[model samples]
Target: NSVRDAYIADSHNCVYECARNEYCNDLCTKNGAKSGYCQWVGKYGNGCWCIELPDNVPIKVPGKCH
Candidate 1:
């Protein structure tokens, strides 16, 4: 499952606000991430998050972010 603020879409530490869940799934898998999902944290609205991704995949971590 993808947690909020897990994968940073950019330097802003924001998720990639996607159009659909399927889109996110494709991206996470294409990028070789173990897994991910979509949900609205409200703060950033609905966006995609990736988990167990590569070290250089831009994951912003717990406590390290939110």
Candidate 2:
């Protein structure tokens, strides 16, 4: 139930930018974020995208905002 509610919140909150794409490389390198890819959903689910590391590389976690 909690997970389902989280997904519902994610669906409502995840909206990709219109003019600019979010970069995993940049977002990951932020002050305290662990190295990882970035993924964002688009307006009306039109542009769900991910910037991931190369194959064979292990992903640690999503980029941090704070």
Candidate 3:
């Protein structure tokens, strides 16, 4: 998993996932969002849909961010 926000793209993940998390410019800005185990969050390639959870939603991951 990518431990850095650099791996996240403005339109990362499927256009759908991107649009979902797109609310925030990047993961860092998203509440409870972080740059750890990004790959584990969502799928890559065809689209960078990481962490299906939406904004304001409680993050299930632990450690750095919500």
Candidate 4:
């Protein structure tokens, strides 16, 4: 069996943010992410890191928020 893990690029823009695991988990399922949770951004506080299959990784665009 093949396994894959993907993550959204870091940012302060309008990607997604969560103060709790439930919040992030909800958002992840609502979207296309298979798993997600709140992660510290070091300065911007807690943020969401959505996980998905490698082929399903969300595109961050060229210059908008990558």
Candidate 5:
């Protein structure tokens, strides 16, 4: 697990639609993230969270969709 937001791609927070796991997984790999998965939350509705190496343990801001 990681705490860096650089690894996360929040679709809902950015007012975007959630993508498929395969789609997110591809993006995550391209962004140097370990892996990615799609999930729905109360706040964001649906979004993707990229997994990264845990080190800094800081909550970084997620990036925009491609």
Candidate 6:
């Protein structure tokens, strides 16, 4: 198996903010992402981590760095 690991998406294009795991999961899969997790990595602090997210599907950028 390739054994792909999860990673944060590009802030300039692929990265969506979510309030909960469910939101992240749904959004990620909808965009063809294999997996999704709610992580505190983006500027908004909480965002949807889309594993194997397609480059074509643009995600919402987490706002508010401050």
Off by over 4 Å in 4: 1-13, 42-45, 53-66
**C-alpha local distance difference test of each model:** 0.60, 0.30, 0.33, 0.54, 0.51, 0.62
Q: Which candidate achieves the best lDDT against the true structure? A: 6
Off by over 4 Å in 3: 1-3, 6-16, 20-22, 32-43, 46-66
lDDT of 1 by residue, 1-66 (tens): 443335546455556777777777777767767666775674445777776565556554333232
Q: Is candidate 4 or candidate 5 better by lDDT?
A: 4
Pairs of residues at least 3 apart in sequence or in different chains that clash in candidate 3: 13-47, 13-48, 13-49, 32-66
Clashes of 1: 0
TM-score of each: 0.58, 0.23, 0.20, 0.51, 0.52, 0.56
In model 4, what is the error at residue 32, expressed in angstroms?
Answer: 1.7
> What's the lDDT of the predicted structure labeled candidate 1?
0.60
Scanning candidate 6 in windows of ten residues, the lowest lDDT window is 1-10
Q: Provide the global lDDT of candidate 4 against the true structure.
A: 0.54
Query: What TM-score does prediction 3 earn?
Result: 0.20
lDDT of 2 by residue, 1-66 (tens): 111101111223442233233354343334223332323443233322333323322222243212
Segments in model 5 whose C-alpha atoms lie over 4 Å from true places: 1-16, 53-66
Using lDDT, rank the candidates from best to worst: 6, 1, 4, 5, 3, 2
Residues 1-66, model 4: lDDT tens digits: 122432344442344556687887776666666777777663334566666733444523344543
Q: What is the Cα root-mean-square deviation between model 1 and the actual structure?
A: 5.3
Off by over 4 Å in 1: 1-5, 11-13, 42-44, 60-66
Ten contiguous residues with the weakest lDDT in model 5: 7-16
lDDT (Cα, tens digit) per residue for candidate 6, span 1-66 = 332324344546445566788887787787677878787765445677777777666544445322
The alpha-carbon lDDT assigned to residue 16 of candidate 2 equals 29
